Amino acid sequence: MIGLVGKKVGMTRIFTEDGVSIPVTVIEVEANRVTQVKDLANDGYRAIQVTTGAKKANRVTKPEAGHFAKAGVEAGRGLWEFRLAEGEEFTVGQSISVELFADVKKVDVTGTSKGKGFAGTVKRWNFRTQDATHGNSLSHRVPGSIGQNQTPGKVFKGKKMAGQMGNERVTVQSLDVVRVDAERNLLLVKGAVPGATGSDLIVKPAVKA
Amino acid sequence: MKVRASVKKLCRNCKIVKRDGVIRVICSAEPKHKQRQG
Amino acid sequence: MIQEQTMLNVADNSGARRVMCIKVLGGSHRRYAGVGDIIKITIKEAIPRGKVKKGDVLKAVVVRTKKGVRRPDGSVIRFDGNACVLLNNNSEQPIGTRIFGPVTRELRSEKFMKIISLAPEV
Amino acid sequence: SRVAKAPVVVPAGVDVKINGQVITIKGKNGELTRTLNDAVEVKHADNTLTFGPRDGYADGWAQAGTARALLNSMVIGVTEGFTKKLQLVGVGYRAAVKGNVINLSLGFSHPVDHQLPAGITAECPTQTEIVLKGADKQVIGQVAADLRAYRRPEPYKGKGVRYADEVVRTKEAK
RNA sequence: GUGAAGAGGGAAACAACCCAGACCGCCAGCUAAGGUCCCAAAGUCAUGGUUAAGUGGGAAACGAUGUGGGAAGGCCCAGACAGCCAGGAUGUUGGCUUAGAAGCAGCCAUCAUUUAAAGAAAGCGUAAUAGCUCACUGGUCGAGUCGGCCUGCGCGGAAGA
RNA sequence: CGAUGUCGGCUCAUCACAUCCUGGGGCUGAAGUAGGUCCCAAGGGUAUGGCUGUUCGCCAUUUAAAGUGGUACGCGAGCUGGGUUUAGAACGUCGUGAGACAGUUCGGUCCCUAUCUGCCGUGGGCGCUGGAGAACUGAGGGGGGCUGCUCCUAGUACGAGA
RNA sequence: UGCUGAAAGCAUCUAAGCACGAAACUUGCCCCGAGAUGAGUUCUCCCUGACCCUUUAAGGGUCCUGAAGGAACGUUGAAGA
């Protein structure tokens, strides 16, 4: 099937009655209204384009506003697209609610992780630090050697070095969905999903099932 | 089987076949004499 | 979190007062041992009439750890001092006839059920 | 050669049909179709099929001999039918059959279910015997090959699926 | 002999290898080595064979019913070779060392009969036996056959950052 | 030889396959469990300490396994400086002596602000044929690919029994 | 490892043909990705004026209008040198 787009609001824990405390992440999966249906005619593939939340009336530009008010929806924050595996139809303008995960058992969550910025190789690539005493000179957390000698004569591409860590799209796979609360539009998953509290999460049914 | 640079007929009922560009020997009586790649 | 070169107190009465862990058994490159974990020990201090003598190499199981154990609700049980029960090398049964101090409920499996039968608290 | 210089005497309701190279034959047991090689000429002169090499192609005789042999097996399969027997030598080995699945119990931990092709059907007069009866020699040969490949004959006790007339030699257990 | 002290064209590139020794000019022609499908000038030229390996375009001893040619041989419609039905026998279990080596652990003999013909024996296995067979022997079958030799090209041997 | 810093350790590696483990098979003097030998296979993995400057080795205790090699015996404009290889000093030995020793022993300055290639990130300009805002298909590229133990089948198959 | 099968009347996994077969190969999982100059696709929005000059050309110039949208500025961010 398809996924839903929600907002991460914190982590909590559910105390079940037997004793086991399940640490859950709360995803407020709001109503996703379909904006565009891409089909084989115009696009050569089938997919739906959804939106969630609502932007201010004047922050929405004229091309976005015309795209939204072309078919029966009000403007939300950002457009997304799900690839419709062979035999599902979602009419344009349709609000898709959260009971799609009241069906399912496991979930993968896609988000942009928290950005650590320019991180060194010890944080980024788990490099082992050099010996922090015993004579070492200005070389404790430096990367070490980065290539062999005259025969390569060059650093191989894909060398692990210091650089931007975080702030990238990552997907956590096969999380147990603990509770689907339609009355407050809450989806609770077992485990840690990517991103800071407030970033948008794409929630799909688990494909490694 | 026995990989060699020389395949011979050790037994009597072993025959020399050529399959997929490889000369090899198959015996019908004793399976030790199955050998290859001569 | 018992590693190699950790000095452990001894919970049973095989005779060892204080032993030292020399390898955390089970798995390659393994770092630590918890309460449900077998280690290899060697004996540094013994009692003069006891069964095991100082300088032997045998096996133990940890029963108390200052790092603790974490129960599934999130509660931790942090003992004061690391403690082990000495097992035989190939029999894997305790060499003691009694056990001092409390032990943990997450030790409860068959051989260590024979351990916790002698235990004054679980 | 000496194979290809021997006609296939086709009897009693033959239904030989040549289009280009392809020959389709129906009889009482069933219908079979062979896509023939370029090197063979087939001849239904005088109500009986002969086989000839083609000009230019080098190995015309080998293709003609395999064509004569395959056509002979084809006509004798659609006439009288090919019957292959297998036996399950071994303790606990059973050979239940339902429909077109063969439920071998070769005693691993899980049962064995083998699917059958279109023309071939398997009948079991004993719990330790299979007889599979079919049109094409190739199809029944491959089915017997897979059923033997589930558990080949051990050289010590002779346990396994086995061609019913194939002699297995036993060796001493050290 | 060339380089040193020598350019030019070829060998992809490559002083010393092959062709050839630059006085200057030319938007002329014929050639040498080397080449003529495209890069890249000129034969997708002509005739007759080989190769199936990407050989050509790395490598030996040795192995092989790969294949093309040449010369002779063994047997063969008084019927060969390969298949398929029968036989494989007696004095006799061959003389012993050995519990039996009932033809196949070892020394002597390896000779004589029935007959269309059968070795007193060649592989295997059994306390010895048994047995499958192999030589060989008749029917069927209907024609080629199975070996060597010299040769051209192939095949495996042929695993490195 | 108008200078190509060398053994070992650390940090970071990368390739070959002549494979240590895992994976798939043939033969066994392969009953089973376990082995042996050989073929295919490079995806991933491939100890921690004691001693020694050591690599290597011996040992201890593991592990599924603790592979063999190439990369200036990879790696000092990345670190160390124990060995070795300056000047001090001493021992044994050789020499009358100055001194010498692939003989030990103690101590003994490891410089460099990265222009170009390379690599890790990150932008500015222009292009994409009027301009702009978004959402995508996806050529291609990269990451990941390890494995033990216990239970069930079943204490069955096999085996005299273990 | 086989199935049928001649060349080689038999036999034969191979020559014609067919089915199996590994953590290796291509995908399936995750990420970047149209500067993929072969620069792709879809949806939406935006501009609907007059005249001069000369070698009348994908020309140069004058006046008026500046659209969507962007950038700058400020308050700033679990975004960041």
CA angle A70, A75, A79 (to 5 degrees): 90
Residue A194 buriedness (CB in 10 A; 0-12 / 13-18 / 19+):
buried
Residue C4 buriedness (CB in 10 A; 0-12 / 13-18 / 19+):
middle
Which method was used?
cryo-EM
C72–chain A nearest CA distance, Å: 5
- C6 vs C23: CA distance, rounded Å: 10
Q: Encoding tokens for residue A32?
A: 């996703």
Tell me whether A156 touches chain C (CB under 8 Å): no
| CATH number (domain holding residue C17) | 2.40.150.20
User: Between chains, do C72 and A21 touch, taking CB under 8 Å as contact?
Assistant: yes
Strand F nucleotides within 7 Å of a protein CB: 9-14, 26-31, 38-39, 46-48, 60-66, 71-72, 74-76, 78-81, 111, 117-122, 132-138, 142-143, 148, 152-154, 157-159
- C67 vs C76: CA distance, rounded Å: 9
Number of domains composing chain C = 1
Q: Do chain C and chain A touch with ≥3 beta carbon pairs under 8 Å?
A: yes
- D126 vs D86: CA distance, rounded Å: 11
Contact A183, A176 (CB under 8 A): no
Q: Which runs of E-coded beta strand occur in chain A? A: 4-15, 21-28, 32-38, 47-51, 79-82, 95-96, 106-112, 117-119, 163-165, 169-181, 186-190, 200-205
Query: By residue range, what is the domain housing residue C101?
Result: 1-122
Number of residues that this document lists for chain D: 174
What's CA B27's distance to the chain center, in Å?
A: 7
Q: Encoding tokens for residue A25?
A: 């992440």
Q: How far is the CA of D174 from the C1' of F35 (A)?
A: 14
Q: Encoding tokens for residue B18?
A: 């050529």
Q: Using CB atoms, list chains with 3+ pairs below 8 Å to chain A.
A: C
Q: Tokens 């087939």 correspond to what residue? A: D42
| CA proximity to D14, closest of D2, D23, D6 | D23
Number of residues that this document lists for chain B: 38
- D143 vs D85: CA distance, rounded Å: 11
Tell me whether A128 touches chain C (CB under 8 Å): no
Q: What's the sign of the alpha-carbon dihedral B9, B10, B11, B14? A: negative
Q: Which long-range contacts (CB under 8 A, 24 or more apart) does B31-36 make?
A: B34/B1, B34/B2, B35/B1, B35/B2, B35/B3, B35/B4, B35/B7, B36/B1, B36/B2, B36/B3, B36/B4, B36/B7
Tell me whether C72 touches chain A (CB under 8 Å): yes
Q: Chain A, 165-204: which CBs lie within 7 Å of strand F?
A: none
Q: Which residues of A touch C74 (CB under 8 A)?
A: 13, 21
Q: Encoding tokens for residue D1?
A: 């050669």
Contact C56, C42 (CB under 8 A): yes
Q: Using CB atoms, list chains with 3+ pairs below 8 Å to chain C.
A: A
Q: Using CB atoms, list chains with 3+ pairs below 8 Å to chain D.
A: none
Adjacent-strand bridge partners of D105: D94
Nucleotide nearest residue D144, measured CA to C1' = G3
For residue A143, say whether its CB is under 7 Å from any atom of strand F.
Answer: yes
For residue B22, say whether its CB is under 7 Å from any atom of strand F.
Answer: no
The residue type found at B7 is V
- C38 vs C36: CA distance, rounded Å: 7
Q: Which residues of C touch A21 (CB under 8 A)?
A: 72-74
What's CA D143's distance to the chain center, in Å?
A: 8
| CA proximity to D135, closest of D49, D86, D76 | D76
Q: Do chain D and chain A touch with ≥3 beta carbon pairs under 8 Å?
A: no
Task: Please state the φ and ψ torsions of residue A41, each to the nearest 5 degrees.
Answer: -70, -60
Q: Tokens 């030699």 correspond to what residue? A: D169
